[PDB]
Amino acid sequence: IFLFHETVITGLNLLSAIYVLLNNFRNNIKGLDLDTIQKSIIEWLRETQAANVNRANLIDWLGRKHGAISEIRNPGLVIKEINMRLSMVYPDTEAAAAAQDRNLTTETLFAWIVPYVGIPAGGGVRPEQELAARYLVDNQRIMQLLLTNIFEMTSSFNKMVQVRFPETSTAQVHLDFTGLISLIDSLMADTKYFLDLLRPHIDKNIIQYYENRSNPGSFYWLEEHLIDKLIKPELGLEGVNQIINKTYTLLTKPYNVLQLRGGAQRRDAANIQINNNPQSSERFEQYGRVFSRLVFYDALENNSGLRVEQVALGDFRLSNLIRTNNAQEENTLSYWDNIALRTYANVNDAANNLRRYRLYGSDYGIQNNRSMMMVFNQLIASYITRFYDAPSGKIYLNLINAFANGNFSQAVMEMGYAHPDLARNNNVFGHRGDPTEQSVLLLSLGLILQRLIKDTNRQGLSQHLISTLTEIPIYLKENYRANLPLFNKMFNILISQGELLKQFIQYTNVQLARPNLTALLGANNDSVIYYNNNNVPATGLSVGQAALRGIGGVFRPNVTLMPLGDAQNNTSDVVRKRLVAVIDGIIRGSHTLADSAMEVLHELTDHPIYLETEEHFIQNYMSRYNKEPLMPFSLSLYYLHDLRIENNEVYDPLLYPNLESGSPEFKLLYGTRKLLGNDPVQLSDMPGVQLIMKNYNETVVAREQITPTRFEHFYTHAIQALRFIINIRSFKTVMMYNENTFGGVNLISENRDDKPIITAGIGMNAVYSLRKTLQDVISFVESSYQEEQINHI
């Protein structure tokens, strides 16, 4: 009964979770199927009357099936918005410098294609219909969602799902699923094996309840939907890969070009025509804005597309260190009062008017600004916050030494090598140029770390630093144990995202040009930050930009921020070098902090045993109750619970490294820390898994017993599946702009028509941890009365 729960039900829940993710992945990729979208648009133009040529009619069309051409789940997401200013996507193909380019929108294109509806006598596609298939599709949105979905899915660990680039004639991108497929076969075989073994001792009704194909989440239901209709054919996984490749190829292929000039008086007049003499850059869709947003920010949109409201510096716990010298000295952090005479605001107006752009926070995890740079800086913020003990006012030096005194000593000790996230009030974030490899750290966090390394008391001794581990409080070492692995894994997720983006940029022909930013925004060609007819030069000499009294500004030209520039400063080659530079900076910082986290962890006497709620919990439980606490592997599946949604994006507080020692969330993280990691898990690292095995073999006779190799194999496959699922939904997905993506879908439901893992309803087949609260799980472990918990199961 207990063993059945721990083997059959656990394996069925894990396989069902794998199916949910794979099926949602399939639906998303089908939703971004560019081959179908283009062919359907051409068919629409072939079969539509001239009067019905409008975006509404096409949206209705794509929502329907037309012969072999499949419907699209969400037509409006992949067709350009009606008023999308076309110069926002196609670089200067456009003349953004006029008030006539303003009347040039997708509406103009729909008005331009009216005369080229219908089929020529030959039956072949019109050239205009091929141009319409290109220019009417929101290609940038497709590329963004495709990249994000792939990046959520990519699972190089355990060689599960590997994104390989075979650069042949097609712009080839392949998702090798062999590892995940072999793992699915393995867990299905193990699930069937324990079913066969336990059939004689379990009620026939229970076995049929977990086997009958009509019951969702049963073994044979999975054998139908997960294997027969997904892994090995409905659209199979290899067909999904085909659509991924074809879509990416179609996104990056050469096309014929239109001359997008227009605007007689309104948006239904066309100076548009075929351009049979195009520049090379126009034959290719450009995705510089998309990649920019993925890395740091998309400067073209309001506030560079970020959520950056000016807040008092004291919103952050460590605001007293957003400073320039010791606490007892006179602060010099200020802002430019007048640029003509280069005067600084005085102490009072500086301390009262200075605001921080809220790109990170101390009280929450990653919940906004899911770009690589801002995720990176928010992780640093939480890092310093969690490990700086306020009552003592100390942080362990080895945590930050390599970062602030080593690889990133420039961003912390020198000025200009950080993004300026401080300014006087009534100065919005605005439209901001590209950072460099050396300005991916937020200036505010750099100043904090500078204060952490350098601050000294009146006797010259270090103010904030503890030099030896022996003097770290106990609970803080517990916090180390539980949170440092999360920090390492997350900085490595950033590294993996950056390296994979680099492989896409390098091993495919994608063009990464930006539009004519200065024309669209009306900014100066020397402007490094522009917002509402204010031009911030690369010197940073603008009223309100942060500065240091008596020394100068926080901007270093050609380092802090690049000019936003015109189309010529926004070519695919240029933006390519800029994106890769920012990526490399993120990667270097993440490597350094991750190595430091592991270094401090290695110095600690860390022997994680599965579901110890705290140090020495097992031995003390044995001492008090003379028995070994129940720690079934099933409880780890609690992490498969529904993620939290905020502003349509998932996050997971349970699996964010800001947890506090002794809390229930912390106890789960402390118990499952090696299980969440990437290291092999031996069966002695899970003592309750070994005890349930021994207790079942003591009852059954030789023929029906289990080998420590069959148990080791099942659980190796149980570990891998759980890690694959968790790494998708709670990490890769959470650390990226994930709206309209598959990674964060709920795996659980109380409706069996909704999900194959059914909790608290007709068809309920979920493990104990998915039907109960976290407190129930922790007490499941820490209760003396084991018989009543076994009675629960």
Numbering used by the authors: 2 to 93, 96 to 236, 249 to 808
Show me the paper's own sentences about this structure.
From the outside to the inside, the virion of ASFV has an outer membrane, a capsid of viral protein p72, an inner membrane, an inner capsid that is approximately 50 Å thick, and a nucleoid of the dsDNA genome and viral protein complex. Proteolytic cleavage of pp220 produces p5, p34, p14, p37, and p150, while proteolytic cleavage of pp62 produces p15, p35 and p8. Among these, p150, which contains residues 894 to 2476 of pp220, is the most abundant virion protein (in the percentage of the virion protein mass) after the major outer capsid protein p72 (15–17). The inner capsid is likely assembled from the proteolytic products of pp220, with p150 as the major inner capsid protein.
We then chose p150△NC (residues 267 to 1101) for structural studies. The elution volume of p150△NC from size exclusion chromatography (SEC) indicates that p150△NC is a monomer in solution. We obtained a crystal of p150△NC that diffracted to a resolution of 2.4 Å. The phase problem was solved by molecular replacement using a model generated by AlphaFold. The final atomic model of p150△NC contains residues 268 to 1074. The two molecules in the asymmetric unit have similar structures, with a root mean square deviation (RMSD) of 0.188 Å. The structure of p150△NC has an open-sheet shape resembling an upside-down triangle, of which the thickness is approximately 38 Å and each edge is approximately 90 Å long. The structure of p150△NC is rich in helices and consists of 5 long helices, 23 short helices, 16 310 helices, and a few short β strands. A DALI search for homologous structures shows that the structure of p150△NC shares no structural similarity to these of other proteins or the known viral capsid proteins, suggesting that the structure of p150△NC is likely a new fold for the assembly of viral capsids. The results showed that the hexamer of ASFV p150△NC could be fitted into quasi-6-fold positions of the map, with a mean CC value of 0.46 and a similar orientation to that of the Fp150△NC capsomere.
